[PDB]
Symmetry: D2
Subunit: 259 residues, 4 copies
Amino acid sequence: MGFLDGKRILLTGLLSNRSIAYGIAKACKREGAELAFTYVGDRFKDRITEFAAEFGSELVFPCDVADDAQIDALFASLKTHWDSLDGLVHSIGFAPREAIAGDFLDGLTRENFRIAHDISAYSFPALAKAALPMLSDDASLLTLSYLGAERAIPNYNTMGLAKAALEASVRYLAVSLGAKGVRVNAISAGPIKTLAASGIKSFGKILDFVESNSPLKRNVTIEQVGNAGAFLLSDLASGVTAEVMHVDSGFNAVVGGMA
Amino acid sequence: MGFLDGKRILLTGLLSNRSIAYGIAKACKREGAELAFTYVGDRFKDRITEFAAEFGSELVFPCDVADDAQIDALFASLKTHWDSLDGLVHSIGFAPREAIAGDFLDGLTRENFRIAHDISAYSFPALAKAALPMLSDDASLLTLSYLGAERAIPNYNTMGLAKAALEASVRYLAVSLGAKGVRVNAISAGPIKTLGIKSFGKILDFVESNSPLKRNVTIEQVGNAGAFLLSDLASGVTAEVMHVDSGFNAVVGGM
Amino acid sequence: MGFLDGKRILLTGLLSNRSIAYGIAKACKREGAELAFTYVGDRFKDRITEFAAEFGSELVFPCDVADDAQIDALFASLKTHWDSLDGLVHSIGFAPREAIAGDFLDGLTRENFRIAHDISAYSFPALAKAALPMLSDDASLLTLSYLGAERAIPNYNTMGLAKAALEASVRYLAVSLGAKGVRVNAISAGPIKTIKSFGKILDFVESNSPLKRNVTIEQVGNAGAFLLSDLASGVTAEVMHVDSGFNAVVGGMA
Amino acid sequence: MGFLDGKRILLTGLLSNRSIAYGIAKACKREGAELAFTYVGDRFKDRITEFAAEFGSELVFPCDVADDAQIDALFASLKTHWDSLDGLVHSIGFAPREAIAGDFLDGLTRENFRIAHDISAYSFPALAKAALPMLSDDASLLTLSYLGAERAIPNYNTMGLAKAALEASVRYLAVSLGAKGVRVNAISAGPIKSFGKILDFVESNSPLKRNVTIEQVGNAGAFLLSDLASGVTAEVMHVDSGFNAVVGGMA
Ligand SMILES: NC(=O)c1ccc[n+]([C@@H]2O[C@H](COP(=O)([O-])OP(=O)(O)OC[C@H]3O[C@@H](n4cnc5c(N)ncnc54)[C@H](O)[C@@H]3O)[C@@H](O)[C@H]2O)c1
Ligand SMILES: NC(=O)c1ccc[n+]([C@@H]2O[C@H](COP(=O)([O-])OP(=O)(O)OC[C@H]3O[C@@H](n4cnc5c(N)ncnc54)[C@H](O)[C@@H]3O)[C@@H](O)[C@H]2O)c1
Ligand SMILES: NC(=O)c1ccc[n+]([C@@H]2O[C@H](COP(=O)([O-])OP(=O)(O)OC[C@H]3O[C@@H](n4cnc5c(N)ncnc54)[C@H](O)[C@@H]3O)[C@@H](O)[C@H]2O)c1
Ligand SMILES: NC(=O)c1ccc[n+]([C@@H]2O[C@H](COP(=O)([O-])OP(=O)(O)OC[C@H]3O[C@@H](n4cnc5c(N)ncnc54)[C@H](O)[C@@H]3O)[C@@H](O)[C@H]2O)c1
């Protein structure tokens, strides 16, 4: 009797029990959804299979979003298991290391730009288009963004451009798919404290700053992002589309650091 | 177990079973919350008592937000029933008719401006301030706004100004109350179709034709989003103005 | 010659040679405009008359925007000298001190809220309405706002609400007056170096803005002159940031 | 003297007397600037040379921004005439036609997406980076965007994504170049078949009840390129008769 009972949801981007996708998966499973997962490379098949089993699922599929052949095969494969798809979680992003460090121009190249936008922005509407023939009429598609799309954040650089494109794709997708009934939204998530992420020194300084300056004086967790994601994927949110919802302890709404 | 199980929530602005506050009330009660209600004027005591009964509550209190004493007396009274308050729904707005019809300047007077901002904007942080001594550390405060705060919409006029101030108060309230743990948000709702004004019918038709989902929102949809924001499911969400409007805010419609 | 040649512009809010209105007045005069000024209260009549003379003007008028009668009498008096008005600069703002210091709720009262919104927001469309019978078809109306309307800034508090209402009034005014041809805009100015908390903000902006410097009244003045001029004839309903880019960044996290 | 007197400004995207770049060129020249121009394709060398002479200039350079080598050669060549560059006008945009007509998903392919973002977004910071060694400390860089970056506009489709990335590049460029003193801004211009329907709608529904002209965009651009705008950076300025600020069609 959870608020996602019977909904069939495909999640990308599950790499560990610290992934945002893992938090979303937990909340969706808690609320009654049936889950399926994608992975990148045969070397990760066994590990994603273990995660799927944790969520009562045997449905895992390769999908390197850099490759048309894998996008164009993903939903043909899923269709042999599920007549229709109710939810899609796009939790994927990448840019070369030099493009998200230091000076924006020093780290700028055409290939760095191309890759960042290809993986981090194009892949969301690309997956939506490949899924369309088996989407339920009231399906819900969800992607993940970050405040660096809206305002300049140190080091975020080329990923900020790609996330702005991603957030625009939410709006154009919502129009394209909305007459059928499909909703499309993003969560603009705050930084997440994990063991490895805190080791990244510049990222830890952001965490500390958000902790000191966000309205709630605390960083968000994957359970809080996961719950917001489960809401947007559900019929509870049937009035909500083309929205970029901040789940960031309110950080986006202030000018911090001046008190 | 509903996702508001045990939460004690005060709702203002419940006038009819087509109110947005009605949809929010229904969704909160569905998810296990205990409700209390305000009303304006002794003549409406019976009607609000009936509504509270529908939601299993006997807690109704007068509160004209134009009156400082009634705002203070509201929470003094509620405190004898509830040790702490977990939610507040602000569904209150008003401007004199001429200030929300026709040309913006034609309906502009100092008193029309004053009333619209007093009732529709000041009352939200005023209620929050009076409630603060009994708010739980996890409390959630919710108000209702409209796209006319962000862009100029025909006839909305002076209410567009007041709603912009209201949405700003959401951000300043979130800062003032957030260290304690209290969250503050607004829902920017689309128009709600009931049994009217030729100008309002034109807006409803236009939203149905031009919104991404090609349909107007219902009080059930706004209510479910409200229940979410009032709940621990939304513990990461504060200072947010969430559009519940079939996506209408995100397009340039009509072309 | 200058790009405001022959334009007749009324400026409010000139209190000193540090005022934003003084910087706007200097830029407008530099570009050929004819200027007139308002003042608040009989005690300031001599001081505004001295400032007006610096700009080659003898046109000064009382206008306490709290008073309906002074707003109405202002444009009757101005019409005696000027058949039409080409520009209006609204540089007026006030909130009781407690409402713009400390905690937002600590300083919140109904009367503090009322005054802040009456003086800082209502007065702009009020002046526009009273000016309309004599506005030229290509007049330009300009007000001043601040980033605290858009995001929560420490201590700005009730003024943030009033400036949000003001920026909304820019849009509704633009629609009301636009068919005639009148344009309506705001400048969201950065803080002007001229309080311990205010110094903290100035330091933060200088350290974290893209241009690594606070703005001057000269820079706000030139942007204002631009918006008041035919160079900006395609621009209305705009809130233009003149703030060294500060609004566009998340500072302090290095 | 004009408010751009002596400023040396390079303009891209001048294809005809209807180009936004032509309106900016005319205003900049009126205000005393010295101009240089780029062009694409040897077949257009004559046409751009005529435009340069109209504005009292002999300085024209080939630059297809799809090609790293042409971007690098552009500023190497320009440096043999100008020791420093005071202004740059990026007025370049392209997507394959099917990506900006009809339904958003019908025109969406990896290669259409790549081209639209390559030409319409990457090229602005690419040019900025190649120009940097010769940019004056107080130089001003200007790009052109459109409301489709902010809200979904019919048919604009993949170009809406690319313009959103472009407007973000304005903000990251302003941070990167700002300590030096360089300013970076965009003008979100109103529109200048399904396109004529949009012009009618904007004329009927914008606050000023009229479409913008390249003269109005050009004067706003000259302002942003000048020291009058020395307090302004990282800004996207709407020059669109107020259209961005309303919900039209409902009256
Ligand atoms: N981690 C945060 O603090 C944070 C904050 C805000 C937003 N986000 C966004 O949330 C999403 C998930 O991020 P995260 O927190 O899990 O960490 P992350 O950004 O390190 O994860 C990126 C994910 O993309 C996947 N990916 C990369 N290249 C791929 C390809 N070619 N094909 C398919 N998948 C590919 C990876 O497997 C990984 O799971 C991302 O879009 C990220 O930008 C993250
Ligand atoms: N109805 C819509 O289409 C719509 C759309 C977007 C936002 N909203 C907002 O949602 C809220 C509720 O809207 P609604 O649909 O229930 O109808 P509504 O617009 O009639 O709500 C106004 C409410 O304010 C209350 N109120 C008025 N003056 C009061 C006073 N002095 N003291 C106390 N309460 C007072 C009334 O009792 C009423 O319940 C309002 O804030 C409204 O602006 C409504
Ligand atoms: N000074 C800054 O750093 C800064 C930054 C951004 C925006 N702004 C805004 O720019 C405008 C000018 O501010 P400022 O920097 O010159 O200083 P200021 O904000 O202290 O000046 C306020 C002005 O309003 C006038 N005023 C106050 N009450 C009035 C009344 N009842 N009737 C008529 N006029 C009245 C005063 O005479 C004064 O000229 C204000 O709107 C202010 O909020 C200022
Ligand atoms: N035309 C409008 O209504 C409008 C409205 C808002 C914004 N804009 C933007 O303003 C700019 C100029 O638009 P416009 O009205 O002059 O027409 P336009 O959009 O047709 O011009 C695009 C320009 O890009 C140039 N270009 C294309 N590919 C190129 C390449 N590989 N290398 C170099 N240059 C290349 C073309 O020569 C052309 O001048 C564009 O960025 C456009 O998106 C236009």
